[PDB]
From a paper:
We therefore resorted to [name]-UbVME covalent adduct, which we managed to crystallize and solve its structure to 2.19 Å. We then tried to capture [name] in its ADPR-bound form through co-crystallization of [name] with ADPR and soaking [name]-UbVME crystals with ADPR. While crystals obtained from the co-crystallization trials turned out to be those of apo-[name], we observed electron density for ADPR in one of the [name]-UbVME subunits from ADPR-soaks and managed to place ADPR within the electron density. Inspection of the structure revealed the adenine base of ADPR coordinating between H142 and Y265 of [name] through π-π stacking. In the other [name]-UbVME complex where ADPR was absent, R370 from the neighboring [name] molecule inserted itself in between the same two His-Tyr side chains. Interestingly, the same R370-involving protomer:protomer interaction was observed in [name] crystals obtained from co-crystallization trials that failed to yield bound ADPR. Thus, it appears that the arginine insertion contributes to packing interactions outcompeting ADPR binding.
ADP-ribosylation is a reversible post-translational modification involved in various cellular activities. Removal of ADP-ribosylation requires (ADP-ribosyl)hydrolases, with macrodomain enzymes being a major family in this category. Further analyses reveal DUF4804 as a class of [name]-like macrodomain enzymes whose representative members show unique selectivity for mono-ADP-ribosylated arginine residue in synthetic substrates. Crystal structures of several proteins in this class provide insights into arginine specificity and a shared mode of ADP-ribose interaction distinct from previously characterized macrodomains.
Numbering used by the authors:
A (entry chain C): 1 to 75
B (entry chain A): 41 to 409
Write the structure that this text describes.
């Protein structure tokens, strides 16, 4: 299904996920499209940091939700 | 008194040029310099040369992507202002909490050590728009010109070497100076694959030329990480070591006493690869412990010297953090640049110039001569 990932600066990424996907897998999908190392990623949904081991259903992330990718921009 | 700005005689001439032409209406300030001028009350001709220089330095911003997000067109800074700002250096006493290793390679000092940092802007050979001032200066139709690069680094480094020669003498010690690959990273732009020998040659040229003025300088420890050969070179009385940490295992860190020095015999000074447009520490004002500038600022109390706040050192991440009274209940908006914004802190301190006789003096005095 569709979820949207969006940086503080407004860059938008679209991912193909399942509710069974773990946040680790989701950070790997972001690295796949953008090359951002999962180490540098903070994913925020509804004010909560998303723990690496939990799943997209744990946080009730459904189709076409928007996650927030908090990055610390590189020179 | 927490930090001291220095600049060369040639730079002072540039500043006098600029001030004279503004006074006549024949030059126009850049937007950021104009904002600083308009926050105070003196006209250009009413203010002395030191105040003028201070207000230009004050137009710097905490964090700037100097190689890609500066326009050199007067909407931020003009090239005339850029030419001056690139020559300004700043030194400060610091506590060094780790050896300055990048990433996760830093080693914490069991007892933090006392030393000094001297932030010096590298030759900026990268731009996201038009050519930079340094590009116009040291490139000849694209060719790097070693002699011109030599003159640029001499201009920018010598005032700090003169300063710390004198400081070593006053403390009845010698100076040990660690130097990184200044200007060799993102600053080198398209020259990244050729820049390394040019920088080492400039450092050797400066030391050879001014050896007679630096009797209390003892050890220079140059570490460009990769891309140069291990070496010791005797330059007069001085020992110049080329020790690239990616090439020589066990190299002492930039924020650590090089071999043959210790706190009882030497003051420890580290040159920081700085930039024209930022406050000292650049990237770490945005919380990033990245680049020589950001790493050394994060690994020292640089931010405390600049802001006057008492930070707290985080051993796990090798970072000097803002006060806990500030960061509590500020998650996501707690980095040092946020502290400066909310408190309206400005970058502005005492300034001296190196006169033709190798003495540091007020800008007014050096201009009189
Ligand atoms: N922080 C600036 C570095 C530029 C770069 O990554 O070149 C590829």
């Amino acid at each position: 299904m569709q979820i949207f990932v969006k940086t503080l600066t407004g860059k938008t990424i679209t991912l193909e996920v399942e509710p069974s996907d773990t946040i680790e897998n989701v950070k790997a999908k972001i690295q796949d499209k953008e090359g951002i190392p999962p180490d540098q990623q903070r994913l925020i949904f509804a004010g909560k940091q998303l723990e690496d081991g939990r799943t997209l259903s744990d946080y009730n992330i459904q189709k076409e939700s928007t996650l927030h990718l908090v990055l610390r921009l590189r020179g | 008194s927490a930090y001291q700005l220095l600049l060369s005689k040639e730079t002072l001439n540039k500043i006098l040029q600029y001030k004279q032409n503004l006074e006549k209406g024949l030059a126009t300030p850049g937007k950021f310099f104009l904002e600083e001028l308009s926050k105070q009350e003196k006209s250009i001709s009413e203010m002395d040369i030191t105040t003028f220089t201070q207000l230009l330095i004050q137009s710097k911003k905490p964090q700037v992507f100097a190689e890609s997000q500066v326009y050199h067109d007067g909407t931020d800074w003009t090239l005339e202002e850029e030419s001056i700002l690139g020559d300004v250096s700043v030194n400060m006493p610091v506590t060094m909490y780790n050896d300055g290793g990048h990433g996760s390679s830093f080693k914490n000092h069991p007892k933090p050590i006392s030393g000094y940092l001297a932030y010096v802007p590298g030759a900026l050979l990268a731009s996201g728009s038009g050519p930079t001032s340094d590009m116009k200066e040291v490139l000849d139709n694209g060719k790097l010109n070693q002699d011109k690069l030599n003159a640029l680094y001499e201009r920018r480094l010598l005032p700090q070497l003169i300063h710390f020669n004198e400081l070593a003498r006053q403390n009845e010690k010698q100076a040990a100076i660690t130097i990184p690959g200044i200007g060799t990273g993102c600053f080198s732009g398209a020259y990244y694959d050729v820049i390394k020998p040019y920088v080492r040659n400039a450092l050797i040229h400066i030391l050879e030329k001014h050896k007679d003025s630096l009797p209390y300088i003892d050890i220079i420890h140059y570490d460009p990480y990769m891309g140069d050969e291990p070496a010791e070179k005797k330059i007069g009385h001085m020992s110049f070591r080329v020790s690239p940490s990616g090439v020589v295992r066990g190299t002492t860190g930039q924020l650590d006493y090089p071999l043959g020095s210790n706190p009882d015999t030497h003051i420890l000074v580290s040159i920081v690869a700085w930039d024209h447009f930022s406050w000292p520490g650049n990237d770490y004002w945005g919380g990033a412990r990245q680049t020589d500038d950001g790493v050394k600022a994060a690994s020292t109390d640089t931010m405390g010297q600049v802001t006057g706040a008492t930070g707290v050192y985080d051993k796990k991440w090798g970072r000097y953090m803002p006060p806990e009274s500030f960061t509590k209940d500020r998650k996501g908006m707690s980095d040092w640049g946020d502290y400066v914004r909310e408190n309206g802190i400005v970058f502005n301190g005492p300034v001296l110039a190196l006169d033709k006789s190798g003495k540091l003096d007020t800008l007014e005095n050096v201009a009189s001569r």
